[PDB]
């Protein structure tokens, strides 16, 4: 079991760590059918998605997907610094797999 | 996959972007039968709803509809600036499909 | 579809609006059996309830009832001004059908 | 329907009101199997639990038990003043039936 | 029924108490498949997980696992002092069973 985001991220193919150390600049969420997703940006232009739940997801991921959107909204509203994101780099925008918050 | 609200909104019919760049002026929520909904207004008079779930919605939207009402409530209470809303313009008041927040 | 709480309230018999323009003074919550409910009071003012779900609540209302209790709690804690309540006024304390928040 | 915690508490057997008029001193929660519970304390030594869901609960009470733990956590974190607790006094620690909050 | 985290922790095998008396230094969470977990750290290097839900958990522990991740996230954001953790010491990082917050 990994003990940090960077080691977690290394367990997966097509992932990488983005180091932001910054608050979220914008938070966008949609309820439109087939686009039940969130999108975040940082002021450097970095853009990330929480993907719409789908066949690339297993059942254990559904609750975690909803939690991640919860986390992004509250981080946004509190202006919490995001340390790192583990993202899938084979999607545009890159898709979030994990987040770390630290000063 | 869209990277912002404007591109997402353009994937649907009968939708438009309203640019508010303002906090929500009032938040109304109802539990009354057949009107289980939320209504928001802005100081310019713009009024929007999250629709009562109905025949126009699918199962994959159910959680997202509940999430949007959560997001509007906490945006209202915290005075969070709403950047844009994507809305269906064939409902009165216009019905929210997506929101973006940015300072 | 109504665009404000007053018009919504006018769609139902046995309701009225109370105009409060004040924060909630006290919040009471019970998990005791058959009293799973929330009660709010306004300073030097009235008490209101969210009814226990039962016979006279249809099924889409169950989530809305839970949401309303969540709304009253967060309003109380954040000290947000309640603008108006739409209530059923056939018993004391009057039962909440809808809430509006505005400054 | 009772309009305050004291009158609510009087509808049950083996309950009583403790008056605190104080913030929560400590908050404890557990996910250990068969001990999925919460405990709170006050600086006068008063200690209360939210019981593990069990045979003594009817099914409407499950959501309410979860709500109470939500309430106690955010009360603790925000240092919200707890006015009174209605508790079952046939358990150690006394088990929470209801709470009232007032500043 | 225990009245505190230490006595709760002593009801189980392979558990121990870590006394921190400090805020959380970092909070990490993941939606990646088979690693739907949270990780927290403290400035002294202590690292703890909320385990991926699995065969070692009963249904009552499921909601409690989700609650604990909620608790850790808001504790982190609010700089809440964590008093103690009860953890399983047969997992690496040690796996949280219970938390207490005080002071
Ligand atoms: C809306 C938009 O188009 N914005 C882009 C940025 O891309 C968006 O955000 C990124 C994170 C992805 O989600 C994109 O899909 C999304 O459109 C764009 O950022 C660069 O995007 C690249 C996409 O492949 C890549 O992620 C890149 O970073 C990696 O590659 C660069 C070299 O180009 C460096 O080697 C980086 O170190 C490397 N990072 C990692 C973790 O491997 C992104 O660029 C990096 O992030 C930017 C936010 C910015 O800080 C860059 O200096 C940095 O290199 C940027 C590119 O400038 O433009 C638009 O803002
Ligand atoms: C409670 C009430 O009746 N309030 C009205 C506004 O209508 C409400 O809010 C709007 C946003 C919709 O949700 C309505 O269903 C709702 O009742 C009303 O706003 C205008 O509403 C029009 C629909 O009836 C329409 O949406 C219009 O915007 C479009 O058309 C205008 C012409 O008026 C312009 O061409 C706009 O560019 C165009 N916008 C887009 C994105 O397509 C709304 O008017 C605009 O928004 C207003 C809030 C205000 O800023 C206007 O200056 C602006 O044009 C307003 C209209 O005055 O009156 C009450 O406030
Ligand atoms: C961890 C621990 O053991 N703490 C105890 C206190 O007990 C804990 O908290 C109480 C509220 C219960 O939930 C217990 O289950 C729990 O372990 C203990 O408080 C007294 O607890 C009694 C029950 O064991 C009882 O509730 C008592 O108050 C009642 O009785 C007294 C005299 O015995 C008076 O009649 C009170 O009016 C009566 N209260 C009511 C509402 O009927 C508790 O003591 C009262 O509250 C204490 C917090 C404190 O302010 C006392 O001065 C006050 O009498 C205390 C006190 O013995 O010891 C440990 O802190
Ligand atoms: C990322 C990393 O490698 N970090 C390690 C610490 O381990 C992490 O945190 C601990 C709490 C566990 O969850 C690990 O699984 C996790 O990787 C590491 O902490 C020590 O970890 C040991 C188990 O691997 C063990 O728990 C130890 O505590 C016990 O043994 C020590 C002496 O080594 C003392 O006797 C303690 O009293 C005893 N504790 C109990 C409750 O029985 C951990 O060390 C303790 O906690 C540290 C955070 C630090 O304050 C030490 O002074 C203290 O002894 C530390 C060890 O330095 O290194 C990395 O930070
Ligand atoms: O998914 C919700 C949407 O469904 C469409 O059919 C309708 O025209 C929109 O106004 C909106 O209700
Ligand atoms: O509903 C929960 C309650 O159930 C009662 O029967 C019991 O006597 C109380 O102590 C409390 O457990
Ligand atoms: O309930 C969860 C616990 O299950 C036990 O069997 C195991 O020893 C612990 O590591 C922990 O996973
Ligand atoms: Na009416």
User: And the tokens for D75?
Assistant: 């009360």
User: And the tokens for B13?
Assistant: 């019919």
CB atoms within 10 A of CB C79: 10
| Contact yes or no for A50/A38 (Cβ under 8 A) | yes
| Contact yes or no for B101/B40 (Cβ under 8 A) | no
Query: Who's near C74: CB < 8 A, 6+ residues apart?
Result: B73, B74, B77, C80
CA–CA distance, A46 with A93 (Å, rounded to integer): 9
| Residue D89 assigned ligand-binding role | no
* C39: enclosing H helix or E strand: strand C37-41
CA–CA distance, A81 with E34 (Å, rounded to integer): 26
What crossing angle do the helices spanning A61-78 and E59-77 adopt, rounded to 10°? 20
| Contact criterion met (CB < 8 Å) for B33 and C61 | yes
Structural domains of chain E in order of their starting residue, each with its CATH number: 1-103 (2.40.50.110)
| Contact criterion met (CB < 8 Å) for C101 and B77 | yes
Closest CA to A72 of A33, A38, A36, A21: A38
Q: Does A80 touch chain B (CB under 8 A)?
A: no
List the Cα angle A6/E75/E61 in 5-degree steps: 80
Q: What is the DSSP string of chain E?
A: --SSHHHHHTTSSSEEEEEEEE--SEEEEE-STT---EEEE-TTS-EEEEPPP-TT--HHHHHHHHHHHHHHHHHHHTTPPEEEEEEETTSSSEEEEEEEEE-
Closest CA to A101 of B80, E78, E96: E78
CA–CA distance, C30 with C47 (Å, rounded to integer): 15
CA–CA distance, C65 with C50 (Å, rounded to integer): 7
* A8: enclosing H helix or E strand: helix A5-9
CB atoms within 10 A of CB E42: 18
Q: How was this structure determined?
A: X-ray
Q: Kindly list the distances between the CA atom of residue D15 and the CA atoms of B94, D61, D96, E74, in Å, as whole numbers in the listed order.
A: 50, 17, 9, 32
Mutate to test the pocket of ligand 1, among A17, A46, A50 (most ligand atoms within 8 A of CB): A46
Instruction: Give the distance, in angstroms, between the CA of residue D77 and the centroid of all CA atoms in the same chain.
Output: 16
* Strand ranges in chain D using DSSP code E only, listed in sequence order: 15-22, 26-30, 38-41, 47-50, 82-88, 94-102
User: And the tokens for E53?
Assistant: 């839900």
CA–CA distance, C30 with D98 (Å, rounded to integer): 4
CA–CA distance, C77 with C71 (Å, rounded to integer): 10
Residue B71 φ/ψ region, left for φ over 0, alpha for ψ in the -120 to 50 degree band, beta for the rest: alpha
CA–CA distance, C6 with A71 (Å, rounded to integer): 35
CA–CA distance, C15 with C62 (Å, rounded to integer): 20
> Which atom of ligand 1 is nearest to A16's Cα?
41
Q: SS3 sequence, A45-99?
A: CCEEEECCCCCCCCCCHHHHHHHHHHHHHHHHHHCCCEEEEEEECCCCCEEEEEE
| Contact yes or no for E19/E84 (Cβ under 8 A) | yes
Q: Are strands C94-102 and C82-88 parallel, antiparallel or unpaired?
A: antiparallel
| Contact yes or no for C67/B69 (Cβ under 8 A) | yes
| Contact criterion met (CB < 8 Å) for B73 and C71 | yes
- Taking the centre of ligand 8 as the mean of its atom positions, its distance from the CA of residue C88, in whole angstroms, is 8
CB atoms within 10 A of CB B16: 14
Coil/strand/helix, residue A43: coil
Sign of CA dihedral E67, E68, E71, E73: negative
User: And the tokens for D3?
Assistant: 């309009």
| Contact criterion met (CB < 8 Å) for E98 and D34 | no
CA–CA distance, B3 with A42 (Å, rounded to integer): 12
- Taking the centre of ligand 1 as the mean of its atom positions, its distance from the CA of residue C5, in whole angstroms, is 46
Coil/strand/helix, residue D32: coil
- Taking the centre of ligand 8 as the mean of its atom positions, its distance from the CA of residue C13, in whole angstroms, is 5
Ligand nearest, relative to CA of residue D35: 7
| Contact yes or no for E32/E16 (Cβ under 8 A) | no
Which of D43-64 are b and which e, b meaning 16 or more Cβ less than 10 Å from the residue's Cβ?
eeebbbbbbbbeeeeeeebebb
Nearest to B29 among C4, C58, C98 (CB): C98
User: Which parts of chain D fold into alpha helices (H)?
Assistant: 5-9, 60-78
Distance from CA of E6 to the nearest CA of A (A): 25
Coil/strand/helix, residue C6: helix
| Residue A29 assigned ligand-binding role | no
Distance from CA of A34 to the nearest CA of E (A): 20
Q: Kindly list the distances between the CA atom of residue D5 and the CA atoms of A46, A99, C37, in Å, as whole numbers in the listed order.
A: 51, 42, 11
Residue A72 φ/ψ region, left for φ over 0, alpha for ψ in the -120 to 50 degree band, beta for the rest: alpha
User: And the tokens for D38?
Assistant: 């919460």
| Contact yes or no for E11/A39 (Cβ under 8 A) | no
Query: Who's near E28: CB < 8 A, 6+ residues apart?
Result: A4, A5, A8, A98, A99, A100, A101, E38, E39, E40
Residue found under tokens 């990330």: A48
CA–CA distance, D47 with D25 (Å, rounded to integer): 10
List the Cα angle E62/E63/E64 in 5-degree steps: 90
């Amino acid at each position: 079991t990994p003990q940090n985001i960077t080691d977690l991220c290394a367990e997966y193919h097509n992932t990488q760590i983005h180091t932001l150390n910054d608050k979220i600049f914008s938070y966008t969420e949609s309820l439109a059918g087939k686009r039940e997703m969130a999108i975040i940006t940082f002021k450097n232009g970095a853009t990330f998605q929480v993907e719409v739940p789908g066949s690339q997801h297993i059942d254990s991921q559904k609750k975690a997907i909803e939690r991640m959107k919860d986390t992004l909204r509250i981080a946004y509203l509190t202006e919490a610094k995001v340390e790192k994101l583990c993202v899938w780099n084979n999607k545009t925008p890159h898709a979030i797999a994990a987040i770390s918050m630290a000063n």
